[PDB]
């Protein structure tokens, strides 16, 4: 499902190590882990905050609110990082 | 072009777009909700795999089985509490 | 045919059926029931019996040893909990 | 008393790795053990819920109850694969 | 015949006997007592020593110093409960 | 003081593995420990009781107190098969 | 002469004086502060430095990475309470 | 932003030992983590005793709250070595 | 002769009386005070020098390092618990 | 400052095993650590107990508060053992 880009991510990181099927079933499972969580808890903000729509500022405080101390910082980076690409490389 | 090129992403912005409205988590999601999410996500992914590539190396191996992902997540203080209540199946 | 095999299972699904109206747990058990927990059992004895023998191959053994179910079960997280309150012999 | 089996299971998990008659011991404890624990419940929840038979359902939410996070959601759908091979396999 | 030997032990019967009447303990301790005590003795000894015979030959020994009491007990989970609040001299 | 013994035990658990004179006096101390312990705990639970008398029952309820989960589970059972070879074994 | 090097220093004792002021922690901040702060700043990082730089050669490598870091701290039970809650990106 | 310095102070420890850009990322974000804390707690202190000043007077109590027990000594130790001297050394 | 030799020590008994009565723990100290605290103290030193000692060799080195002490302090669970808020300096 | 002793110490546990300056130094810090812990708490007996001076029964019952659990009862022989020597060797 998600064997694709995670595999494409490996090589990216790691262009000479490979990755099993029963491994990659486990990436798969935390992909669609931390995916549930964070659109989760996004979806709780929105709702507490009488708001109809899930902004990419949802994501962000949901990202704060789920995931470890440092490990949080860097994934607020890379979102506001990748999020501006996007908006301004139209 | 792409969403997931003009974001400079691996992770498919277009298919978790669709994951967040399917889903019913919200009424309307926005367009920079998807791209952030899918950013977080392949950050994450890079972050376990990367930890895990190192530990295939140490033991001897190329290949990643579950057991590098299982000691490089409970090795790493801080990916320890995120998949704190998690079983990695053969890990 | 064998209940066992209609069910694609190892673990005697008979056997497990008969425990369950012996052991006075149930008035009456049910059919699936027996099944379900054979396969549940099956399931975890596999997984354990997976992480021994890794182990047993790590130091350098093809017997498992319970040492092996041991440096198994307390290195899995999620074994560790199930089986927390339990003393392996010879561990 | 399940050396049989265990062992039957562990050929397809490692059919080349043996396994000692003390390490089979324990297996046999183990295999007890989760037995009587999941019947226990099974069995409180048939009484909590006045019902007279322990169905799947109960060892289901049984295993729910007992089993650790992930390790609970494979044991579930292992059973629920099971169970339903042998009531269609007729 | 021996009172150890009557039981199948190694442990002393009849000092265990001595020390639980001696120790001021009952008013009168009676048969089986030493001789079940004396047993649970002689199992744990069994027990730790196993685990630390194990340790011993790990390293590269044949005699067993305290280093392999100490590893013993601390990585059985079970053992390092009973002898928790313990130190092992030249552990 | 129990040297003779735990060397005995030894011999019959690894009949080719030595022990230190300082080992043995930790081993030494291990046993007269857990003896101190169950004694206590058995007189405990003669008094609480009213009885003038340590019974092997009251080695066993104590064994079950102070020892952990599954090490205590042989302990009894090792105990209850030596007393009872002792007993017949007149 | 630099007041890094008057106060027998590593770190830039200027820099870190500009940062306590510009930062607008205090109204005024005094001229030993930056000095002992600078001092104290030398020291951790001289420290974790070392214990890092000793798991580098323990492994067999001559640079330091992130995985000595982390190694490193974690070891210290000290530095480890320090850098509780803190994640080493690749550690 | 510190890798001069901290390149400096690796060399007069491990004089042999080198270090990755990317674990200089890290140093980097350890000494602005540090700073960031005990600036903010001396910065704490001066409030609550009414200061307009941050003196080190304040660095130090902030180091012995934030740092580990025999880790916060040290710290002391060379801040007032350090103080010192630059002081004296006019 | 030596109060030291006296009381069959290497740890100078005297230095500690001295200490005893400076400190001004006390208004008057025993004759033995001093003497139990030598004691204990050269104890407690021949403890931690022993497991110092020991990790020293199973490395591979003869001078006992810091890194000795903390492995050694860290690894028995009695000391840890009494050196439980200590940091050793490039342990 | 006790590097002598500790030396001497360190020959007669282990005499072929050398010990750093380095090293030295955290012995140092450990010996006058403790001798400060225990010198408190005898003196804070004393004071409870409305006693002008520290006996060596003070020391004792320090040793037995502060130290851990088995490592406490060797402190007390050793002590005793040697109060006793020093008592009688006159």
Chains 1, 4, 6, 8, 10 share one sequence.
Not at chain 1, 15 to 33: E, Q
């Amino acid at each position: 499902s998600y064997s694709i880009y995670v595999y494409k991510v490996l090589k990216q990181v790691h262009p000479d190590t490979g990755i099993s099927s029963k491994a990659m079933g486990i990436m798969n499972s935390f992909v669609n882990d931390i995916f549930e969580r964070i659109a989760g808890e996004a979806s709780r903000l929105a709702h507490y905050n009488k708001r109809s729509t899930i902004t990419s500022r949802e994501i962000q405080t949901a990202v704060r609110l789920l995931l470890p101390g440092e490990l949080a910082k860097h994934a607020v980076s890379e979102g506001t990082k990748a999020v501006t690409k996007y908006t301004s490389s139209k | 072009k792409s969403r997931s090129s003009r974001a400079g992403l691996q992770f498919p912005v277009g298919r978790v777009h669709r994951l967040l409205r399917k889903g019913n988590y919200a009424e309307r999601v926005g367009a920079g909700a998807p791209v952030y999410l899918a950013a977080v996500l392949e950050y994450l992914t890079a972050e376990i795999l990367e930890l895990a590539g190192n530990a295939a190396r140490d033991n001897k191996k190329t290949r990643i089985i579950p057991r590098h992902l299982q000691l490089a997540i409970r090795n790493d203080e801080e990916l320890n509490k995120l998949l704190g209540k998690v079983t990695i199946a053969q890990g």
